[PDB]
Amino acid sequence: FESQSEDELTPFDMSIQCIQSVYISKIISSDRDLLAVVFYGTEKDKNSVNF
Amino acid sequence: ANLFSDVQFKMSHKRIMLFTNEDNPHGNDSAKASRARTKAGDLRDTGIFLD
């Protein structure tokens, strides 16, 4: 969540943009594929293993 | 890996993308690094492609 320069999107924002672009590309090209989004390092947890 | 297993269809490609800006996630503890390496190797043998 820190940017070395100013007026530059942070790494988290860049990752979100890339994920959104991949989602749109998958929807347009092949909507039968499966996509998942998992976040690690946060405080709250939501897993089938309760990690 | 558990999320991949949860899928019930036939997958021709299992892929993982890691969006991070830290090159040394586990430097203080060496056991965590060894566990991560073992898990990555196990995923590689299982047939999961990591980027």
Binding site: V22, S25, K26, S29, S30 | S12, H13, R15
Partner: peptide, 23 residues
């Protein structure tokens, strides 16, 4: 392997359309 699309595995990354580029 080289040039494979990162979004759709098994399909080569299509080059973006260039329209007309006069020599």
């Amino acid at each position: 392997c080289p040039g494979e699309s990162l979004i759709n595995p098994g399909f080569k990354s299509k080059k973006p359309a260039g329209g007309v580029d006069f020599d």
